[model samples]
Target: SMVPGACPLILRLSPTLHSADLIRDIDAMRWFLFEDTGVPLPEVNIEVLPEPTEKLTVLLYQEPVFSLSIPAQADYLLIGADASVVGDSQTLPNGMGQICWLTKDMAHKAQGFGLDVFAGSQRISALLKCVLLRHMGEFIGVQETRYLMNAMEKNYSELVKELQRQLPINKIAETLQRLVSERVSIRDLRLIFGTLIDWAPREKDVLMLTEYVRIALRRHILRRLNPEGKPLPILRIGEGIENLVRESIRQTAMGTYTALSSRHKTQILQLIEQALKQSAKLFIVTSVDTRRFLRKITEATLFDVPILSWQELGEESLIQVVESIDLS
Candidate 1:
């Protein structure tokens, strides 16, 4: 029984556990658990037990379960749980893994301030944002762009302060702040937005963040196309990642036209040719109406690019095909 996929394992801790004591225990046990058993501990989950037991439930990886205590009905109490690296790796079945208590003192403080209780969704969102900010420099390429960097620095600094004031004082918020201070990469920013989409939020926020990411990518592509900052009015077709990719490729072909420039068109054709030489696939995902339009566009371009329309790709094997691509 080898360990299952690295799907996150979450456990809810009982409230009786103390905060400082729990952290100490976790710090002490982490090394022994992973080093001795060779099992990695990705993360730990915890929640503040609400008062009067207002229909609270503990979900271990989204599975709701009753409280672990006898009273199981106490209010204004802290719920505690611990996680250990567990898998059927033959060598370590029943192996001793790191175990510690969950602390809700910080959450209790947040609730006292009338702040929304830090739920698992928020925890995961903040964690993702941190991960993206940590690697932002890598995606956009690092260089001294005084104007851009200064603006980014100022914006991020302000964001950091807001996060500090708004975020619950907990390990997660602390980790996020540290990551922001380190400057996140553009690629990581996209990944973070992807994670945010999974969590429930205002539709507008989702759309805005998604568009921001696409624009960032577009800027990078533009820089690659004209590093000398030639005044090229960036023309984008449709929207979102898929549409953006198509539009970028299309723009490369329509280079520098007043009414119609063949320069970009030639450049785009060459780019597509080179991409095909490397076996790159031209794929599209869209609604039925959009798919029809896309078909028309592909045909009219006559760019000799291999196009996979959404209808042709179909829905039956969509996930399988997407997973097959090496995004890296």
Candidate 2:
């Protein structure tokens, strides 16, 4: 398995500019992650490709721009750039990427929130980190990463107090990884650690502990999914599929898993994928009893879509079922 490190990038320069600025910016980002933010990110590996063609393409006829292409093997692509990156007129095939544009015009409007000191490469590096963390945090667990960042801001005693309340740091690491693997944010660390301290003696399974944490962070999760109060579009797991998973569960000393036949797993995946295609975007909704088990079954096929349990989502009115899936 690949360990967490700086993201690899393939930089395509336009020859009008130098790579020094980009490299310096990336280095600053790496520095900020480790030194200021307390995230131990290694230096990024950048492969600078050949210069663009001299001839002007209609797509990028006006200005020279540098571009970067991330690895195709990436399970998640979080895109953010100044105007130049997108002005190059690039396309990521098959809906494999999400674009977040960061430009100077917006920066001028919102300048004072700790960004006043940044200029040139420093500013770009800061913005890139903001975007990278959203994806990279998946590797480190956003809440876990933030804890380190917050630790940097606190005095030793303040930090010691929180550390005393936390589970063993190792368990904290495992718990954080488990929650973030499903894209749950641990922003409210006080509540999260408190919940764990309350439940740790009763529950030893990391998954069950995470379920309890998820319940505690329910509102935060909902805010992330639908910050603007827009209805959350989701795909519901029908009773047949739920029953299939519940009955097929197999628990052993090693761990709990589903013993459903491979063929049925495939058929269920095919139906869910079909329903997914019917909606523009959706979260797969299942009961708490089935979510962890069904997540294992669906991850291989539906890695991009999130699997949410009814327990994690407290309000049904906010969710609109785009489609439903059953054994049929």
Candidate 3:
């Protein structure tokens, strides 16, 4: 209940980090948190396990902070990847971490070892930073530093100096890494930090915490949902989409979740595929209760469907109904 222990953020991969500076850089990042914010250090541990395609289950089982293609998965894997992108953020629908896609011709030509690698280039510092933020923040929960940082009255020089530093990049990274998946802003750090302070101590599920965080950033969120200085329009993906989801979703002693039947899944895929020329991201605006159901039902589909709540957009989200596909 007191000071927490270092949560292991396992990076299952190869060859030495070999750079002592890289190790120091990682540990130094953690220690800075300990000194500036009292957040506990993550035990940044790495392992040697090359060639991942054969042992894909271990990819999911390990749930690493990041993994190399030493053994990429069917597609985006923490330790393995298919011929895909670097950030597997949307790649694995329900997954929590990142997977790297490395090859000879493309970016981050991976180390030959069965080991995970983020050592060669500093280009992905932001990526590593966010992953690190999640590994540590999710484990211990974010502290209420900003709750106090904003309140203290100070002299002119002192206030200016403090503002110059801004909130530590570490803090901002941790907060955004959580909220952005819910499709919200990282620019308004104060409101974000305020929401974290208000809810994190009381709540456990990051999903629910994010729902409320959306409300706290109501104005800011709706602003992005609609473009500026342009026609205010949205895609009406079909109200029937929600109703169809409710029909296919199921409940049982084993677990309760949403889904479309095999038949419906096929139709839904076809409906969208025909509606658009190619694979475009799916963005749906549904009522709050229905949003949760849509998320679960769509979570398994091979698509990028990020949902937005009605409360986030409300009646003001008038649409041009760019394309309509009905399964009924």
Candidate 4:
């Protein structure tokens, strides 16, 4: 019977003179099987017994071949067949007969040994299972990383594209309107307003300034009239005269002054001043550079009205201005 934790079967083959060498070779084979199959050897007990009359007898044990459970623990049963015989003469079976007999017997019993004793093909089974698990784990990790990275990259790229698409002028204007509607502190509004002013060209800055003043005047007039569905009173000459002055100056600077002649410029400026004196609101088409042309007239008349520029109009501001005024 095989001892517990020991090789169950031992072969009594023609003994090699160097038992140590044979043991070393068998140990190497053991390691090779372990590496290839990922199954540890439970315990293998190899015995070298002297051959009797140079005859080789191979024995298969009925007891469990290896102490550890076969397929679950180790794997296959390792049967080493030794055919080398020394000083055989004619007493032993011929080498060919010995070799053929050993080969045939081993082949017939190998499957039975694995199935009945080992319970299954442990070596290949364990190896394949381990390889599959490792591969799956690695694949899942890589896939997850790729998904997260792709989502993050796509989102950031889209944000950058959107930012790049907006014109700087539009962006500044829109931002200013939001800041104002939100009732931001004047200081903060000024700071943001200053930044936007810096970004625009002088002409754009002038346009924005005048537009803002125009919108503000329109809003004020609508509030005063409180007009119902009917058309609100047209702005008389005086109600928003200061805004007009600033617009005139801005327009003249841009060489787009509507009053072409000096006489027309003087007459328009005096008319605007007289209307303001009477508290009338004037509706006029003014250019962005109206400030320069109107400045001379404003100085000549010594007008005390507030000269508001339209240098900070934004989309939101425009919407607010539109909403505040009565279209009728």
Q: How accurate locally, in lDDT, is each candidate?
A: 0.34, 0.57, 0.48, 0.35
Off by over 4 Å in 2: 1-95, 98-167, 251-254
Better of 1 and 2 by lDDT: 2
Worst 10 residues of 4 by lDDT: 319-328
TM-scores of the candidates in the order shown: 0.18, 0.63, 0.46, 0.22
lDDT of 3 by residue, 104-183 (tens): 33334433333444424231233445444433335333343342343433423454244435445345445444554344
Worst 10 residues of 3 by lDDT: 52-61
Q: Model 4's lDDT to the true fold?
A: 0.35
Model 2, residue 182: what's the lDDT? 67
In model 1, the worst 10-residue window by lDDT is 84-93
8-36, model 4: which lDDT tens digit per residue?
33434334322434555545655664453
TM-score of the candidate numbered 2? Answer: 0.63
lDDT of 3 at 209: 57
Best by TM-score: 2
- Tens digit of per-residue lDDT, candidate 2, span 1-328: 7766434332333343335477878876677655432335544443433545422111122222333442222211224333432312234333334443333554453343333324433433543564454444434654555566466456444543555555566667777777766666555556766687788788778878887887777777777677777777777878987777777775344566656687887788777777667754766788888787877776665555777777777655476766765473
lDDT of 1 by residue, 1-328 (tens): 6766433334454344324244444444544443422223345455556444323233434454333232332223222121121111111112212112223664455456554432333332322222322222222212222223244455465543343343233422222232222222232433333433333244323223333333333333334434565432212123443343344444543341113235544454454445445443333334432332233344444332323333333233323232122111
Q: Distance (Å) between predicted and true CA of 67, model 2?
A: 10
Model 2 lDDT, residue 62, Cα? 23
lDDT of 4 at 261: 48
